TrEMBL record, chain A:
It is found in: Nucleus, Nucleolus. Belongs to the EBP2 family. It comes from Chaetomium thermophilum (strain DSM 1495 / CBS 144.50 / IMI 039719) (Thermochaetoides thermophila). It comes from the Eukaryota. Transmembrane segments: none annotated. This is rRNA processing protein.
Automatic annotation (TrEMBL), chain E:
The keyword Ribosomal protein applies. Signal peptide: none annotated. Belongs to the eukaryotic ribosomal protein eL36 family. It comes from Chaetomium thermophilum (strain DSM 1495 / CBS 144.50 / IMI 039719). This is 60S ribosomal protein L36. GO terms for molecular function: structural constituent of ribosome. Residues 1-20 have a biased composition (Basic residues). It comes from the Eukaryota. The chain holds residues 23 to 110 of 110 of the full protein. GO terms for cellular component: ribonucleoprotein complex; ribosome. The lineage of its organism: Eukaryota, Fungi, Dikarya, Ascomycota, Pezizomycotina.
Automatic annotation (TrEMBL), chain F:
This is 60S ribosomal subunit-like protein. The chain holds residues 63 to 150 of 203 of the full protein. Signal peptide: none annotated. It comes from Chaetomium thermophilum (strain DSM 1495 / CBS 144.50 / IMI 039719). Residues 74-88 have a biased composition (Basic and acidic residues). It comes from the Eukaryota. It is found in: Nucleus, Nucleolus. Component of the 66S pre-ribosomal particle. Required for efficient assembly and nuclear export of the 60S ribosomal subunit. Belongs to the LOC1 family.
UniProtKB/TrEMBL annotation, chain H:
It comes from Chaetomium thermophilum (strain DSM 1495 / CBS 144.50 / IMI 039719) (Thermochaetoides thermophila). The chain holds residues 22 to 264 of 316 of the full protein. Its main location: nucleus. It is found in: Nucleus, Nucleolus. Belongs to the BRX1 family. GO terms for cellular component: nucleolus. It comes from the Eukaryota. One of its GO terms (biological process) is ribosomal large subunit assembly. Residues 13-207 form the Brix domain. This is Brix domain-containing protein.
Amino acid sequence: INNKEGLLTALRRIQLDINPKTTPFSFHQSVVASKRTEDSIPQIEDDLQRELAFMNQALEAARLGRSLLRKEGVPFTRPTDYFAEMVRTDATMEKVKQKLIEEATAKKAAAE
Amino acid sequence: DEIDPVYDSDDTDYNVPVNTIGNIPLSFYDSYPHIGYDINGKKIMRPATGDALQNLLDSIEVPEGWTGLTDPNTGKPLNLSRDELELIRKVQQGLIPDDV
Amino acid sequence: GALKYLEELSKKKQSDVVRFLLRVRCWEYRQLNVIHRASRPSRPDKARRLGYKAKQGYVIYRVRVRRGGRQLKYQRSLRATAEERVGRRCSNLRVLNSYWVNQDSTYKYYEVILVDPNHKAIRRDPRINWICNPVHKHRECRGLTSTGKKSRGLNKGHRFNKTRAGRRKTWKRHNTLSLWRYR
Amino acid sequence: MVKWPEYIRLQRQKKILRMRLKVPPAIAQFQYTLDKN
Amino acid sequence: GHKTTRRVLKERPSRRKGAQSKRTQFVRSLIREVAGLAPYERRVIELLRNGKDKRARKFSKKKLGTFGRAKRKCEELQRIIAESRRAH
Amino acid sequence: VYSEKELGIPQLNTVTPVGVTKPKGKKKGKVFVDDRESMNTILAMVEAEKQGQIESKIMRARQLEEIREARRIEAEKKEAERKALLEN
Amino acid sequence: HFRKHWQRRVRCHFDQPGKKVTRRLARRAKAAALAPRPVDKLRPIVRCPTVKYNRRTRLGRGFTLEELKAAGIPRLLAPTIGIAVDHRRKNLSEESLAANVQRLKDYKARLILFPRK
Amino acid sequence: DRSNIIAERKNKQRVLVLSSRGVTYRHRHLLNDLASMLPHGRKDAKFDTKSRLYELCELAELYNCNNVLFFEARKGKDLYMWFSKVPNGPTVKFYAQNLHTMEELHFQGNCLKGSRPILSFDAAFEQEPYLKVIKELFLHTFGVPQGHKKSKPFIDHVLSFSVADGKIWVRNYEIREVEKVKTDINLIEIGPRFVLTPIIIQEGSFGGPILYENKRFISP
RNA sequence: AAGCUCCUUCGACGAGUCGAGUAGUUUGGGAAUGCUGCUCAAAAUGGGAGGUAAAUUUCUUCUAAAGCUAAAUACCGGCCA
RNA sequence: UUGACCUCGGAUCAGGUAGGAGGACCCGCUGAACUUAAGCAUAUCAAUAAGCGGAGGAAAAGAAACCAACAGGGAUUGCCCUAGUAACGGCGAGUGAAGCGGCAACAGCUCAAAUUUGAAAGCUGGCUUCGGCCCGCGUUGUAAUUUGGAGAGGAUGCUUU
């Protein structure tokens, strides 16, 4: 069952006003896409084309948001002089590095 | 009734630091005059520079609130208040944990 | 029905009347011997529930055991260490069961029920004459008390697969190469 | 000076502790028994 | 699956194998009044008279361990405060 | 065992930020600075590196603050040069 | 899977005919003591549990207390006349009850009962 | 003012993340990963399954949260994600699938903890009704409001939401800027790789009558 | 002394235990697979374990923290054959 | 001054008991390393060997806080397959069960929570012609009745020693 009127009356009870003329982009930071991204993915089992489609959808969201955020004037670029908490700890960021060192040194030893 | 999403008096995140600094080690912002950034993005600087005679007197006789810890908010070392020191003593002794 | 009231009071053991009693008894038990004897159980409802009777041949002993680790942990429980120390002291008696009586920051206090297999009141009574048999020698040393049955995983279910008949017997069964005649 | 036996001291120190420590009302009502008459 | 005619069963005498007798409620209520309160229960009592129901409920969560036990203990202690002023 | 510079290892976003990463080889630039008073502090820094860390906490903090003051002076000259370039 | 010491935990079965004749002499000695009596006890017809074995019945452990009552066999006399009792099992259906009651009446018809002393 | 939102007009939003009673280490890591991206939320665990779904409403009222993100595990193998607005708002059931969290070393991306996201939604999120009320819930839950005093200032990650067959695919990427040749952007993937198939939508807070049903769901 | 039958009468069921957090050990088994230590510490139409997207935790199945008990099983030792 | 009751001790008092041996099999505690991966550390070896404690002719386990999702089964144990399956893993080496089903053998019970209260009805001693006398234990509870797929109490009428 899809009580399409019922979703509408429930939705307007929740809704906060998101209008670009009235509320700035700093409030919501949400972007809808022009394409529906189902046309971008022909086959779901195709892994590389699927991740490229999700990359490309957030690609335009990152570009469209950056233009709207620079105009409004809040900072966007993290300074080189700034350090804070990270979603992954420094220890997790280390063994990410030697995952690529042993992958790089394997292909150089394979060539050597 | 709609829930009013305010922070209660007993909540863990009732008071937050201004410095937007978590469990990051304070070895950073040592070679940098500033210490941390605030919510709006502007910069937070070290308050002042301690005197050599004051530091020598602090090394000979440490204060009551001295802990040897660098404050995540200011470049000066963090010192416990009188009420905080009394709270630690009442917790350790346990004779009166709560007043009245 | 005085013991139903004692059962509810023993459940509530951090409350004011009982914590007072547990404080003053722990001071007394500390200055007595480690493996001293009790003329009457300190918890008569727990002794009754565990099999103690006011009969000749039943004695109660109180043990203090040191608490803490052995980050290696001693797999023997503190009750199992308590039960082993009574049996090495009262070597003529059989350890029936044990129960908790007191606690401290350095020690735990247990009360152990012992049955004399050589008294005549015990051999005459068919509810306790089973402990007279020579299979039940030193039950606390073989993990045959309620503490030992707990630590050996002697329950039933998918949750206790490795230890429901003995892990060493099950490991012997699962590692045995069975070869038949007409293979 | 002289040394008392251990159980003599323990039962005497149980006197002082009972009269010094302040007792919850469940046990404190046992300190009030009846009169001779 | 298969269609079999169902039978009614005699009532299990192991149903509700706790203690729902009227006598065991007398023992539990009498012991609580004699015994008093734990130190942690005294803090929940003090918050409930002061009106800090949310702080008392959160304190019961940290002490007992599960939310349903926090509901149970705060309900029993609130009924103790209710019966205290009834005698008063 | 090979040198990390020879390996084409991507830059990771640790607690130390990546900033804006420059492409390798294609228009990689660098900076330019000589100074008079800040390079005097680089003299003060290098004997402190050569003679090792100071056991005295007061003198070690004093010599670090001098390098911090040199960086603050060098930065203030950089915004002064940026203001002069904006004027021109 | 020869990773452990398989040589010290290998069991051979040269006593398989020896255990067989020992097993037959145990059944022989059981009917020596219980001479007119049978060597086993009555077990009910029970339906195997899972959907793989729904359509096959087998011998269970003992009869329901309701199954003894419908067949007219008393519960404290049933173990003495060679009928196994199981208080854990329930009927839950009339087909399980009717099949086992009919089994108990068939046992009742074939039974020779002897008078005490 | 105890909202801890220094802003012009306030988005007073709190969420409460819960794992029920049978969550695996994979489910617990995803709950720890999501709660590291919401500074306006607090964590809870060991919720009794034998309790009632509207006692989740009592739980969040006690902790002063107007949204709940509930992790319900079946058999210790199947994850069900609940989104709701606690007093009266609608509720959505999901079935989580294909979980990948930050501890896997092949992700190679990182973002400032508590920093404000760029929520990326789909066109099909915008047109279709049942996904459109879902987009309202993710905007409230994954919002990280404006002046929140535990929110990092610099904005460096994009949360991606997309549909492929009938399922919502959630991806998280790191904003990275480089210089051009003679600043253009590129995203590097960070974490919570998981798939959400919409199961059923409730009008009530955790009860109420039933508005959307998915007649394509093949249960595990 | 005992078995039942009936009923305008009753029916007591195990706590420093369970459980929450943590450290160790162990397991095919971080619904913690079990066990131990440590901190906190329960309930009474209760509690434990399962099933189920099926619309709210609906239903199924048992009753932990007391105890005994032959046979089928093992056996390079003991009395023999 | 006398006499309890409670607790703690002495006695070359009476009556008993434990140590040690054995340890093939059994129950616990504690606990390696060599080896393998053509190097090696996770792992494996191995919850093994060595070390300690404790029984019997067997030991142990055992009458569900069980398995199940069925038309349900029904204490424990062992064999056959389940099955090299599920599950876990430098996913390499590897590790590795269980329910069901077919058999072997089958057996069930004792307490605590009750007021015998119109009668401690129970039990250890040691003195005896032995037939029955005292002493003590015990009401802070020894017998009888009862142990939750129950049970008690009245009534009821048959059936049992």
